[PDB]
């Protein structure tokens, strides 16, 4: 019976957005299961489908809206509804596919794609890479518009890919990372439209293996270094959780919590 969080690109503040993200994290996460200070998303196994998702209503100064579905375990996007159609990504397995059926049930046209929603897959369809794809509010306005318009087929596929690539980032990743949230914050703040820098990107690709590195750390100290990039592309290794604290907001459950 899923909980929804509205947002509108329309007039949006720095506050209104921080307001937004700070909010969906709440609806995402267990409250406290936290390792060495970082919050852990709910664990796919126990989770009843009742609690498996949350929904996000996104609206426009162009005055239209669409609803996104998010895997609570995941934080990522599984699909969306625009009006009377709903679209979902190709499920990576049996279990996952049964869950989605619980999503937009009212919808008369349920479409399911042949491809995953991994960045790799989308970048391929977008025909471009994430760093050629501008992020910001203007981008997100036009993105929502597109997804709606997609359901009507006024919009092409690579256009749709690009739109997803925008949202997954501006939401799933913003939610996963205060760093990414705060970057969008200042993007809105100075009203810039610009593609994601490397730091943002490598963050996005390493999120899975950070979640692992951390929970499995010894009292915060990483088993093995995790290579990252700074805003300028300069590579650097992460040996300890201490520095991630200010950055990463959520981790996918990996191991049973320590004693």
């Amino acid at each position: 019976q899923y909980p929804i969080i509205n947002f509108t690109t329309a007039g949006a503040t720095v506050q209104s957005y921080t307001n937004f993200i700070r909010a969906v994290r709440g609806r995402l996460t267990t409250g406290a299961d936290v390792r060495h200070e970082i919050p852990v998303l709910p664990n796919r196994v126990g989770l009843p489908i009742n609690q498996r998702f949350i929904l996000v209503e996104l609206s426009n100064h162009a005055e239209l809206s669409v609803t996104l579905a998010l895997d609570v375990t995941n934080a990522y996007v599984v699909g969306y509804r625009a009006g009377n159609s709903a679209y979902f990504f190709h499920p990576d397995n049996q279990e996952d596919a049964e869950a989605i059926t619980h999503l937009f049930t009212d919808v008369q046209n349920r479409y399911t794609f042949a491809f995953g929603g991994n960045y790799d897959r989308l970048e391929q369809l977008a025909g471009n890479l994430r760093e050629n794809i501008e992020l910001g509010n203007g981008p997100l306005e036009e993105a929502i518009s597109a997804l709606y318009y997609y359901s009507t087929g006024g919009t092409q596929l690579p256009t749709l890919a690009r739109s997803f690539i925008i949202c997954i980032q501006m939401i799933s990743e913003a939610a996963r990372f205060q760093y990414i949230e705060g970057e969008m914050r200042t993007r809105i703040r100075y009203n810039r439209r610009s593609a994601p820098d490397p730091s943002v990107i490598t963050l996005e690709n390493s999120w899975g293996r950070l979640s692992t590195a951390i929970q499995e750390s010894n009292q915060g100290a990483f088993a093995s270094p995790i290579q990252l990039q700074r805003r300028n592309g300069s590579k650097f290794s992460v040996y300890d959780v201490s520095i991630l604290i200010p950055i990463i907001a959520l981790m996918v459950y990996r191991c049973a919590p320590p004693p």
Epitope: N128, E141, T159, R162, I166
Partner: nanobody, 123 residues
Amino acid sequence: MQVQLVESGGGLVQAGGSLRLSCAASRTFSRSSMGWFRQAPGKEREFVASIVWADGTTLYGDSVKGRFTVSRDNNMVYLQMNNLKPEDTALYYCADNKFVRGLVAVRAIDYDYWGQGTQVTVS
């Protein structure tokens, strides 16, 4: 249903003539770029020229670089075509790229919405 772009100005000139294309965007705000592509029947869309919204940097495809000039208005956008060669004969299109970093986007794949088109011809 889409953003609904349209261009006028197509026609017949003698070889060497000049011609000028015009375009109108119809709830449309953030752009990051707009560009004109041309397609001879049976072939695929050549890039031609584009103007990065924001800055207004102009970028022209190889064959045309010197004779064609591009400009933004307000809404509205323009392509000047000067000294026409019979090889310019083709269908010309308007594109709104709402997404790609404006410098990097030169391709049919890179633009989100397409104008309807208007024809061009020559000696």
